[PDB]
Write an enzyme that holds these catalytic residues in place. Structure first.
Site, PDB file in Angstrom:
ATOM      1  N   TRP A 179       0.899  -1.154   0.000  1.00 55.04           N
ATOM      2  CA  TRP A 179       0.000   0.000   0.000  1.00 55.04           C
ATOM      3  C   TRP A 179       0.945   1.214   0.000  1.00 55.04           C
ATOM      4  O   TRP A 179       1.822   1.334   0.854  1.00 55.04           O
ATOM      5  CB  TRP A 179      -0.850  -0.067   1.272  1.00 55.04           C
ATOM      6  CG  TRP A 179      -1.812   1.048   1.513  1.00 55.04           C
ATOM      7  CD1 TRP A 179      -2.801   1.492   0.679  1.00 55.04           C
ATOM      8  CD2 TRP A 179      -1.950   1.789   2.731  1.00 55.04           C
ATOM      9  NE1 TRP A 179      -3.552   2.458   1.311  1.00 55.04           N
ATOM     10  CE2 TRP A 179      -3.051   2.658   2.572  1.00 55.04           C
ATOM     11  CE3 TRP A 179      -1.257   1.799   3.946  1.00 55.04           C
ATOM     12  CZ2 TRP A 179      -3.474   3.525   3.587  1.00 55.04           C
ATOM     13  CZ3 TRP A 179      -1.675   2.658   4.952  1.00 55.04           C
ATOM     14  CH2 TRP A 179      -2.773   3.509   4.766  1.00 55.04           C
ATOM     15  N   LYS A 239     -13.134  -1.267   6.604  1.00 56.14           N
ATOM     16  CA  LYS A 239     -13.687  -2.167   5.609  1.00 56.14           C
ATOM     17  C   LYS A 239     -14.616  -3.262   6.118  1.00 56.14           C
ATOM     18  O   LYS A 239     -15.667  -3.501   5.512  1.00 56.14           O
ATOM     19  CB  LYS A 239     -12.557  -2.760   4.744  1.00 56.14           C
ATOM     20  CG  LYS A 239     -11.726  -1.736   3.937  1.00 56.14           C
ATOM     21  CD  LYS A 239     -10.489  -1.208   4.678  1.00 56.14           C
ATOM     22  CE  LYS A 239      -9.741  -0.113   3.890  1.00 56.14           C
ATOM     23  NZ  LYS A 239      -8.396  -0.058   4.475  1.00 56.14           N
ATOM     24  N   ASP A 260      -0.090  -5.040   9.656  1.00 54.48           N
ATOM     25  CA  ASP A 260      -1.108  -4.126   9.155  1.00 54.48           C
ATOM     26  C   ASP A 260      -2.262  -5.084   8.901  1.00 54.48           C
ATOM     27  O   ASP A 260      -2.204  -5.921   8.006  1.00 54.48           O
ATOM     28  CB  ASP A 260      -0.672  -3.447   7.855  1.00 54.48           C
ATOM     29  CG  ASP A 260      -1.667  -2.392   7.384  1.00 54.48           C
ATOM     30  OD1 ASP A 260      -2.730  -2.232   8.017  1.00 54.48           O
ATOM     31  OD2 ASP A 260      -1.403  -1.712   6.384  1.00 54.48           O
TER      32      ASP A 260
HETATM   33  C1  LIG Z   1      -7.282   0.532   3.794  1.00 55.80           C
HETATM   34  C2  LIG Z   1      -5.884   0.229   4.420  1.00 55.80           C
HETATM   35  C3  LIG Z   1      -5.451   0.856   5.575  1.00 55.80           C
HETATM   36  C4  LIG Z   1      -6.258   1.980   6.134  1.00 55.80           C
HETATM   37  O1  LIG Z   1      -7.118   1.856   7.064  1.00 55.80           O
HETATM   38  P1  LIG Z   1      -7.848   3.069   7.402  1.00 55.80           P
HETATM   39  O2  LIG Z   1      -8.756   2.580   8.439  1.00 55.80           O
HETATM   40  O3  LIG Z   1      -8.721   3.596   6.273  1.00 55.80           O
HETATM   41  O4  LIG Z   1      -6.995   4.216   7.714  1.00 55.80           O
HETATM   42  C5  LIG Z   1      -4.246   0.523   6.145  1.00 55.80           C
HETATM   43  N1  LIG Z   1      -3.491  -0.461   5.561  1.00 55.80           N
HETATM   44  C6  LIG Z   1      -3.929  -1.095   4.429  1.00 55.80           C
HETATM   45  C7  LIG Z   1      -3.095  -2.174   3.775  1.00 55.80           C
HETATM   46  C8  LIG Z   1      -5.100  -0.755   3.863  1.00 55.80           C
HETATM   47  O5  LIG Z   1      -5.446  -1.360   2.687  1.00 55.80           O
END
Ligand SMILES: *Cc1c(COP(=O)(O)O)cnc(C)c1O
Ligand SMILES: *Cc1c(COP(=O)(O)O)cnc(C)c1O
Lengths: 396, 396
Positions: A130, A246, A211
């Protein structure tokens, strides 16, 4: 004075959005979105969260500040989702959790904390990863290095190049891992590979940072967490940045958590106090709304049951479209083999299209994809599958 | 590894909270709070915000990400509240606004932006000032220096020592100003002094940064903004970090804004892009809920009318207690003169009590105040005024 300040680069993704909206062609398809969309092409607020919100509306009596680490139930609920309801980390009190402004805020507080309270200088990010990862770590003053991940030829994880790359990392270097639904390849390590990764990490002395933004989107809530759990059962320390954007569809409410795991209770409490100092100097305390919503759903049987069903529905749809995509492309006939699409997890994956092809797909057909060939599977509906696969076949 | 991480210092304010809660004495009074409380001793969610929330509940169709700078109406509404509905800054398009996680988040994004995009090295903070100011600026890598403000003898602003102190600041140094209700003295510059400050600032080349967290608590919504407006009519550039935590009672929803004012539209847009890059690497985008609530109240006549009445009610109460305090102390009889309390604005002010006295007020009477003698006027109710003033008289 800002009279000589140079403009920041236009972020590619933001760009497509404006080009697509301005696309007069009525048959346009946007596959470079980054959010979930149902068969209707909409991103609705979950039914379980709407119920949670009516409840908060009826029962909130004050909007007074939360503690620096957020709502307590919220923290406990996330520790259980991540490590399991009866983990030693929870029983031995080795982990502390701060509610933060989304998964991104969790990565920035981890970064700030690591930068001022430890001797970590580099963070190892997968190639590719990302794009905002690099920006977060670099903003805290950390150096970002990349380890090999993707295999452009076979559309798989180059595990050899992976273990070989990390041998350049020294003890004390942080190594960033995507818990599941790797953004943007959708390629994830298998359990055997995670255990091999967990073991090697201990051996070389890496500080693993996970993450975890898509728990529930690959196979299930618990299934998706076993990679992280393979590292937790083996390390004395680790950090996990999780997001609920998400899986709860709470994108704009900014709800995530930063979990610090230390060797023991005494040390985790001492390190966490510095992590709280990092938060106080940034945003002070976190936003209650979205986190309150998560805490009331997870703490209630009925609501949690409905939420889990809504999450499996999203997971299954994303899995339905990956199948539909692969064989609707076959019915369109062309030397291909997008079957690898079926083995990838989450909303994203690299189509294998060149920038040459992605560019004409857009200008000639109005099918928008990222220049890297990244395609969001949730942008596909059973309705746009044929006119999509036909555009792809024509540029191949 | 965190095995040798040293614990962060226990923040004084957090401490009193735990000592007070554990205070078995039934007549206890907490005046070291930092939030507003009504005559009942409660911090309720405003009626106008509850209405705004039912509305959002009925009409929200998605929880999808906001842009990096937040909801547009919200931004426009704050620019109008700060500079006036028909200001040249708004008409000439010289200002850009980002919705941020509270007033603290606005100060940290200002700090980050200033640190990486300009040559500013120091920030001048008043003596004394809100303690978290130093932590925010130091975390971004900026140096904090202090200019003289309070006059311990007369309980007033030492304007001479003030202008004399700032002469040590060079062109390019940022000078932090409290828009109104100075935390924690409650002492504010008069209009004449603000104009003298605005003129001198231009002359020496200071980059003024305004911390505007209490608009509406001193005299009124527009009255409170004339100091900032005296600087805006005179500078090509300035930054204003505003909060809606106190005036809307939205503390835990984290709603504030960071407003960048540049010489012209072209330059403000170019600098703002870098300010947005600063936000993206921190929390990504802001929390919608509290900001949505602010935008629907301010954009609606009926709701805004109710909110304004609720704000004047809080302002008047705080003004009632300052009077009650001063003369209930007189009826208790003692060589004093807490009349200066009547000339100060907001919820805070220094009582003039020594740490010797604040300590026994607490141990002997269970009246909790900050060691600096800071006292929150909103912790006083017409009911606890006598038993409060009697404790104060006894330690004098
Ligand atoms: C979407 C995403 C995030 C972000 O999360 P948020 O809650 O929107 O800040 C962090 N890491 C990855 C890999 C993502 O795809
Ligand atoms: C309360 C306060 C802030 C904080 O605003 P938040 O919205 O809570 O982050 C900033 N500056 C001053 C002077 C304050 O008193």
């Amino acid at each position: 004075m800002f009279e000589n300040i140079t403009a920041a680069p236009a972020d590619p993704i933001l760009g497509l959005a404006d080009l697509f909206r301005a696309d007069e062609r009525p048959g346009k398809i946007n596959l470079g979105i980054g959010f979930y969309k149902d068969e209707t092409g909409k991103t609705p607020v979950l039914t379980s969260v709407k119920k949670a919100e009516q409840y908060l509306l009826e029962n909130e009596t004050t909007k007074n500040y939360l503690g620096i680490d957020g709502i307590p139930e919220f923290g406990r609920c996330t520790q259980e989702l991540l490590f399991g309801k009866g983990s030693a980390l929870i029983n031995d009190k080795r982990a502390r959790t701060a509610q933060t402004p989304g998964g991104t805020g969790a990565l920035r507080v981890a970064a700030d904390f690591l930068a001022k309270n430890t001797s970590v200088k580099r963070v190892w990010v997968s190639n590719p990863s990302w794009p905002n990862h690099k920006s977060v770590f670099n903003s805290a003053g950390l150096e970002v290095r990349e380890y090999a991940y993707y295999d452009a030829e076979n559309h798989t994880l180059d595990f050899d190049a992976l273990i070989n790359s990390l041998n350049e990392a020294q003890a004390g270097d942080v190594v960033l891992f995507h818990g599941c639904c790797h953004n943007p390849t959708g390629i994830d390590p298998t359990l055997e590979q995670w255990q091999t990764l967990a073991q090697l990490s201990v051996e070389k002395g890496w500080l693993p940072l996970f993450d975890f933004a898509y728990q529930g989107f690959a196979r299930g809530l618990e299934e998706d967490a076993e990679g992280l759990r393979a590292f937790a059962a083996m390390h004395k320390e680790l950090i996990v940045a999780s997001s609920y954007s998400k899986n709860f569809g709470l994108y704009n409410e900014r709800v995530g958590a930063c979990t610090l795991v230390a060797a023991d209770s005494e040390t985790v409490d001492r390190a966490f106090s510095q992590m709280k100092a990092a938060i106080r100097a940034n945003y002070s305390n976190p936003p209650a709304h979205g986190a309150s919503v998560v805490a009331t759903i997870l703490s209630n049987d009925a609501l949690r049951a409905i939420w889990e069903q809504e999450l499996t529905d999203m997971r299954q749809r994303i899995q339905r479209m990956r199948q539909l995509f692969v064989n609707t492309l076959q019915e369109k006939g062309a030397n291909r083999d997008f079957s690898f699409i079926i083995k990838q997890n989450g909303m994203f994956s690299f189509s294998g299209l060149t920038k040459e092809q992605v560019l004409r797909l857009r200008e000639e057909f109005g099918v928008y994809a990222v220049a890297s060939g990244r395609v969001n599977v949730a942008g596909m509906t059973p309705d746009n599958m044929a006119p999509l696969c036909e555009a792809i076949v024509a540029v191949l």
